[PDB]
Design a protein around this motif. Structure first.
Motif, short mmCIF file in Angstrom:
data_model
loop_
_atom_site.label_atom_id
_atom_site.label_comp_id
_atom_site.label_asym_id
_atom_site.label_seq_id
_atom_site.Cartn_x
_atom_site.Cartn_y
_atom_site.Cartn_z
N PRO B 57 0.77 -1.24 0.00
CA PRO B 57 0.00 0.00 0.00
C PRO B 57 0.82 1.32 0.00
O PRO B 57 0.63 2.13 -0.90
CB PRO B 57 -0.88 -0.14 1.24
CG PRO B 57 -1.15 -1.61 1.29
CD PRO B 57 0.12 -2.27 0.83
N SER B 58 1.71 1.54 0.96
CA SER B 58 2.48 2.78 0.95
C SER B 58 3.84 2.61 1.56
O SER B 58 4.33 1.49 1.69
CB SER B 58 1.77 3.89 1.72
OG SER B 58 0.44 3.55 1.99
N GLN B 60 4.58 3.40 4.70
CA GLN B 60 4.49 3.07 6.12
C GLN B 60 3.92 1.72 6.50
O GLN B 60 3.85 1.41 7.68
CB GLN B 60 3.73 4.17 6.85
CG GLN B 60 4.51 5.46 6.94
CD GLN B 60 5.99 5.24 6.78
OE1 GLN B 60 6.42 4.31 6.10
NE2 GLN B 60 6.78 6.10 7.41
N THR B 61 3.51 0.91 5.54
CA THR B 61 2.96 -0.39 5.87
C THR B 61 4.02 -1.48 5.79
O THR B 61 4.63 -1.67 4.75
CB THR B 61 1.78 -0.76 4.95
OG1 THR B 61 2.27 -1.06 3.64
CG2 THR B 61 0.77 0.39 4.88
N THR B 275 0.17 -2.50 9.57
CA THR B 275 0.46 -1.08 9.64
C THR B 275 0.52 -0.60 11.07
O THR B 275 -0.36 -0.91 11.85
CB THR B 275 -0.55 -0.26 8.86
OG1 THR B 275 -0.66 1.03 9.48
CG2 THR B 275 -1.91 -0.94 8.86
N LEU F 21 -3.57 13.13 -2.14
CA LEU F 21 -3.05 11.80 -1.82
C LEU F 21 -1.71 11.58 -2.49
O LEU F 21 -1.37 12.28 -3.45
CB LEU F 21 -4.00 10.69 -2.28
CG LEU F 21 -5.48 10.68 -1.89
CD1 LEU F 21 -6.33 11.26 -3.01
CD2 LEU F 21 -5.92 9.25 -1.60
N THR F 22 -0.96 10.60 -1.98
CA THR F 22 0.25 10.14 -2.67
C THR F 22 0.03 8.74 -3.23
O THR F 22 0.58 8.41 -4.28
CB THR F 22 1.49 10.12 -1.76
OG1 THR F 22 1.20 9.37 -0.57
CG2 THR F 22 1.93 11.54 -1.39
N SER F 23 -0.78 7.93 -2.54
CA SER F 23 -1.12 6.59 -3.02
C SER F 23 -2.59 6.33 -2.81
O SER F 23 -3.21 6.94 -1.94
CB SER F 23 -0.32 5.55 -2.25
OG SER F 23 -0.83 5.41 -0.93
N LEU F 24 -3.16 5.42 -3.60
CA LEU F 24 -4.56 5.02 -3.46
C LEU F 24 -4.75 3.64 -4.04
O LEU F 24 -4.29 3.36 -5.14
CB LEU F 24 -5.47 5.99 -4.20
CG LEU F 24 -6.83 6.26 -3.57
CD1 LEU F 24 -7.62 7.23 -4.44
CD2 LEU F 24 -7.63 4.98 -3.32
N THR F 25 -5.45 2.77 -3.31
CA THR F 25 -5.58 1.38 -3.74
C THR F 25 -6.92 0.75 -3.38
O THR F 25 -7.42 0.95 -2.29
CB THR F 25 -4.43 0.50 -3.22
OG1 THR F 25 -4.97 -0.67 -2.58
CG2 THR F 25 -3.56 1.25 -2.20
N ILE G 12 -6.61 4.95 1.71
CA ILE G 12 -6.30 6.31 1.31
C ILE G 12 -5.02 6.73 1.98
O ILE G 12 -4.89 6.61 3.19
CB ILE G 12 -7.43 7.28 1.70
CG1 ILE G 12 -8.57 7.21 0.68
CG2 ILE G 12 -6.90 8.70 1.83
CD1 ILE G 12 -9.87 7.83 1.15
N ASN G 13 -4.08 7.22 1.18
CA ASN G 13 -2.86 7.81 1.68
C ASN G 13 -2.19 6.95 2.75
O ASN G 13 -1.50 7.47 3.61
CB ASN G 13 -3.16 9.20 2.25
CG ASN G 13 -2.11 10.22 1.88
OD1 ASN G 13 -0.92 10.04 2.16
ND2 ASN G 13 -2.53 11.32 1.27
N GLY G 14 -2.43 5.64 2.69
CA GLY G 14 -1.80 4.70 3.61
C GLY G 14 -2.69 4.03 4.65
O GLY G 14 -2.34 2.96 5.15
N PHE G 15 -3.82 4.65 5.01
CA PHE G 15 -4.75 4.13 6.03
C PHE G 15 -6.05 3.58 5.44
O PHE G 15 -6.76 4.29 4.73
CB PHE G 15 -5.07 5.20 7.09
CG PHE G 15 -6.51 5.24 7.50
CD1 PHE G 15 -7.08 4.22 8.25
CD2 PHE G 15 -7.32 6.32 7.13
CE1 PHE G 15 -8.41 4.26 8.62
CE2 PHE G 15 -8.65 6.38 7.51
CZ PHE G 15 -9.20 5.35 8.26
#
Lengths: 508, 508, 508, 51, 51, 101, 51
Positions: B57-58, B60-61, B275, F21-25, G12-15
């Motif tokens: 995901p990013s 931080q995970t 996370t 946002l920087t990421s989206l999934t 979203i944005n990691g969370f």
């Protein structure tokens, strides 16, 4: 944290999956430089004794602690001209194999002198009890495996055959990743027939006396030795190497084997000498933990059969310091089982069931008089036992589902209790496991015979294990027992740091 | 206490059953909220090579280290002319299974790049060396339970049946709380007769290569990854998945089975993203341990059989850094056993026995030359080898008891020697386990073949494994071997602080 | 310091064979003198319940934590009209033995009270699950050895016979050094013949619950107390103790053994009291760890068989505070089993395989949406499940070769999943393993029947084991669950010092 | 290719073999990429010979 | 493609290039016809520069 | 198919879109059964009665999301941090043994 | 698509934020949709509800 009775102190601990940051440090392991293995062929080999004599190759050469000896042999079996026939080959498929462990069992005593100070053990009787624990499966499968390694489960060989568990069975039919049986051991059979058998191979046996070690854990080696030397005196009988099934006899019975002959050839010790690197220096005088095994035994006249109980008082003995641990078990008399070898060859190795024991230590009587034998088992299974309760208190009823028959009992093995001293005896104030000088104890203990055919004359044993710290210098060989003093054991400052498990580890 | 040659210092401990006082704490166990799982299906599998890609995901995970890939399949066998015979169901209860471990054995190489720096492991033959080595029973019976993972212990299936430890039997027939044999792993049979057979199921195999781990404990999972892509590539032959016993096939060397094909349906792979909590943050850049296997292989023209010895010469090499561990097992060659399937399906996974080895590290020769085969086994077990001495160097005298056949010999398993260079070879001073320079080895060695049945042409091996540190930061993947300098390594402030054994664990 | 993106400092460590210089200290272990065992007979015992009451020797005497009760019995069976003839002895050789752990499973609920405060758990439903979870080979083959202990791995006793691995067989067939089948246990027999049987013997069982422990290790004995008492309130059926096999009985659901009647004699319970040594004192109020496990169940009427698939939902419950762990599993037919003697005797305690499961905590649902049924076995063997993956989710393909007999599938035990709450489920920060209060949880999950003959009608339990402190001081003993507060959990100083795999060792 | 140095390890591991040709040609390699990495096909026009 | 630089301070290079594996199939048409010969010819076809 | 759940919509009534946002999934997981996607009417089927239909297999082919990004103009500058509304949709369910017809 | 799909999570944005979709939508659908909107966006999937 706070808010229960007394307020407690608090720490948080990370999960496994993520720390993630902690202070990690690269570590370099460094043992050097040349590591080797020598084969000192035994000088002066015989049927009566092997003798090795072997001095470390060089100055300040540390010496590894696993030592052993390989010995090529030859044996021939001859048929006894009674009960005949006698059809079928003398050696059978799941009937006959080596006694475990062979060489050690037929050793009257072995001696070794580290650096001019003598250390000896009594291999014959000490073993089969010292072997029962503290063994785990991991370790059993490791170093130990080289010598025939499986125990004697059944009270008598006849019944055993044929089990998925049978002690002397061929390798196939032993469950995957588990102690294999004594028929596995590979040695060539030159000729097998009626009236004649002959076989040859080469058996590795471990040297079993501490300091040297047989459990797979590794601890410092004994620099700075000048001259090690061993000495093996063989037990006179020499038939005791073989095992047998009482079944094949059959019905008379004079066992089909009428005899045996066992021969040896030069066998070689195998030591390993590491030598340390120049930079790091080893100190000129170093100290090691050395234990001591001795056995005090007693004779008797009144016998029980086949399942009668009784009582035996031991014999007053004196011990020079509080022992670390202490073993106590009954057994089928050595005096007998020696004449008329066939019993000697087919007789197994198991201990009568300890109904209760009651021990009078220094200034006490009746200690553990009220502990149910059941109780005597829980401690110690803790110390190391590794056999299941069922084995202890030997008996098992196995019914046979057909009209009409009597169901039948089996006997497995005796209990072989032990009492670590400061733990299960309770050591009087201001005194501790290490302390000299003299004491004395005698254990009076009731027991029963459970083996279903033979009339078992008993004996008692008592294997003590002292704790000592010996210094090896060059050239000196100081040794001390009772290193602690009375004043020092009073008000020794305690530690929360180490805990009783780590203590458990050192031996061994 | 100050009773020894050199005074020693005392401390006290309390027996387990009573402290009863020492400071207690309450240890709350914090783990980031929101653990999740997801099957990532293969973007563009095929029959030749398949490959997945997934992005965490990013930043931080934290992904976790234990990954595995499950793959559904079908097969179909068809009875050939002209063997028959051709009787009974084409599969039989005791004779058939998957190879341990099924898709691992087929992979030509598995490549997996992390965060942009590609690390890969060849897997066809490197997997079986690593397989016997470090696992114990309790950990064998955990995670590594998903692939049909019981090691082939006889030198040929033909003899195996029917022993209750036979390497490919049915579930019942395998002893209680043990390692269960290969046949037991389930998949449904849609049909079975003579002339045809067809099975369907889903076999798990957990992707092997480090960093990702296959041994039970957890170390911080890779983060902060940016992207990660696996991809396999399989051997064209593919027929290797299934394994089959010999007995059933008839004489004239004719084989019941040949030939058959395999099928795969799109397969998947399960990653686990975790996370962290609001307040506890993970450092920008972190550093993980980074291992690296390699394989060097040398084949010869000469052949030996059915049990004659030989000696052989490994090719010379030059090594960039002393590696942590090495494995030296010689196995029946790869040149043959990809030609002509019945043999290809049939052959087991055992290697020839080592009569002894002579090795030369740099500028020295004769290392280990006088050490008897038995010695090698001991050091190998010490490293964790886990198999009993009987199978190493395997052969077994299982003896017949009928007038008057000869008495069968069994070829059993194989031996695979391993050495650790600091532990075993001894590195010259100023040099240690991580350091760099150019040290040439060349391992001559003598070997006997043991299975009674076939002639064998043998290809030797040497697996080496360097230990490095690799730093991940998003997105970067610096990696370096020997971190690690000659003067720094020499200075070496040494801590009597950490044990060896704890060090042993974070293998490897 | 040097060479990684981030320099990380060094330390050098000495090889195991060579320390050889480090602070060697002689350590003495000290525990209070005299530990003595008393057997309390039990006044006020009946077939409806057992009652114990015990005064300590006094206060100031630490009572050891291990406890057990030995009970003598008398069972007679009688033949059933009219499936007859029932030729051959009423009890079979491999067929029929004790269920395990006999007296525990029969006990409807168990209550004990330390020193005024009642601490009781339920035995009948809890134990067959909690059994699996924290035992390797050594620990299960140790204390838990005394009562029969081999699990019910097979999905029905019908299919087992005659298997080497069968759940309940004679000691003769087992693999050396591993858990014995339940049949080995002694059942001294008075007589048996078709139409009747009579057995008589003594059986040991250890108290299960907290604090007193049934595990391998041991910790500090409870003190200082004035009163203790145990109440076994037996279940009303009492036929459940013995276990039967369906192969013997055909075919109208008419079974040989119906009916029969058990009897007990006076039972006694053994506990030992160590007394500390006068010099070093124990404090006036000591604080222990305290666990307690309350089950929650649901009844369904939707019937599925023999191997149809379905889905369920638990119903809401509202746990007071986060629980340390949580065992979820479907198991068959609690109400259904009891009617009929036939049912009580001839059915095992395996649970159906989880095809997949989803779960909801407070405020989030779909935790573990898409984690493969397999992914759920990957955790836990992390929390020590102690079985193979194969047997978990167990279905068994076993093929038969003849033309033409359809191959048969075999029932097996199903997964019992667990999850510690910090580790898997993930938690709102500021919430930890102890903290009170309110939360609500509903489990949904899909299971599939796997055994063949009987159609199961499910119900699913959800045991939850809380964590908490308990302080035992002479007048009275108190306990809090929710020993932590919210503000203290957040911002608790984190410790790199203690390892996490240590918390595995705590319990239990 | 994947060359190492003295502890800078694996340099150039991930660069496509095509990527290799690129930086090389800047130092002057001078031949079409087609003939570097040389394998070429010629397909045959006659039934039904392999190409 | 979504591709970020590892940091500020990293200076990426101007020459970029994509690679892409492909799979083409053609099937002859009726009624031509025709046809004797293979479908691809030694001179007649290739890719269009730049594909 | 519209993706459903907050902050996405739905009833338009368009509103201020998410930046920055920087990421989206997105992941979907689909229930194993998969037959629920079709409809049918009872009229056709036989009297006892068996349904004319069982059984059937469903597949998919690449399926792809679609989302558009505006970018703002240089004159008007958008804040470092911005707060949206957002809701969550719990579900609680309980079932009973008694049937009624 | 929604009725068949068990759940759906869009981080979203990691969370991560997720809403079980299978059971929720059918009852939430009937609710906020006028006749204008029914013919608006929602028109894209099959839309007409069960009477």
């Amino acid at each position: 944290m706070s808010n229960s009775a007394i307020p407690l102190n608090v720490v948080a601990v990370q999960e496994p999956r993520l720390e993630l940051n902690n202070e990690r440090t690269w570590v370099v392991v460094k043992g050097g430089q040349q590591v080797t293995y020598y084969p000192f062929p035994s000088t002066s080999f015989s049927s009566n004794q092997f003798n090795f004599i072997c001095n470390p190759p060089s100055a300040q050469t540390v010496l590894d602690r696993l030592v052993f000896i390989q010995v090529p042999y030859d044996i021939t079996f001859t048929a006894n001209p009674s009960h005949a026939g006698i059809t079928e080959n003398l050696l059978q498929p799941g009937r006959d194999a080596f006694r475990a462990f062979p060489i050690s069992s037929i050793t009257n005593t072995l001696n070794a002198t580290i650096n001019g100070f003598p250390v000896n053990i009594e291999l014959a009787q000490i073993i089969h009890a010292l072997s029962r624990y503290h063994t785990p499966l991991k370790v059993k499968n490791g170093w130990m495996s080289m010598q025939p390694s499986f125990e004697d489960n059944y009270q008598s060989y006849r019944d055993a055959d044929g089990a998925n568990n049978n002690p002397l069975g061929v390798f196939t039919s032993a469950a995957g990743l588990s102690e294999l049986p004594r028929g596995s051991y590979t040695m060539n059979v030159v000729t097998n027939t009626t009236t004649t058998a002959r076989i040859t191979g080469v058996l590795y046996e471990q040297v079993f006396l501490p300091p040297f070690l047989w459990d797979g854990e590794q601890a410092g080696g004994l620099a700075n030795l000048t001259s090690l030397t061993f000495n093996w005196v063989l037990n006179n009988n020499l038939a005791r190497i073989w095992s047998h099934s009482d079944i094949t006899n059959d019905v008379s019975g004079n066992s089909t084997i009428g005899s045996m002959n066992i021969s040896f050839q030069q066998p070689s010790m195998y030591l390993g000498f590491v030598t340390p690197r120049l930079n790091i220096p080893i100190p000129p005088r170093i100290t090691y933990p050395y234990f001591k095994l001795s056995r005090y035994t007693t004779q008797f006249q009144n016998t029980l059969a086949p399942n009668a109980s009784s009582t035996f008082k031991s014999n007053v003995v004196q011990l020079d310091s509080i022992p670390r641990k202490l073993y106590l078990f009954v057994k089928q008399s050595d005096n007998v089982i020696y004449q008329n070898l066939n019993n000697q060859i087919t007789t197994p190795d198991v201990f009568l069931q300890i109904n209760n024991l009651n021990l009078t230590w220094n200034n006490q009587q009746g200690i553990l008089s009220g502990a149910s034998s059941q109780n005597l088992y829980d401690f110690s299974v803790q110390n190391g036992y590794n056999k299941t309760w069922s084995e202890f208190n030997g008996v098992t009823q196995q019914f046979n589902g057909v009209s009409g028959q009597p169901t039948k009992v089996i006997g497995l093995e005796g209990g072989i209790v032990c009492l670590e001293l400061g733990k299960d005896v309770g050591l009087r104030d201001d005194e501790a496991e290490g302390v000299i000088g003299n004491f004395n104890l005698q254990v009076q203990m009731t027991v029963t015979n459970t083996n279903q055919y033979v009339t078992v004359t008993p004996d008692m044993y008592i294997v003590a294990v002292y704790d000592g710290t010996l210094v090896i210098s060059n050239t000196s060989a100081m040794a001390s027992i009772g290193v602690a003093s009375k004043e020092e054991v009073l008000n020794a400052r305690i530690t929360h740091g180490v805990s009783y498990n780590e203590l458990q580890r050192i031996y061994g």
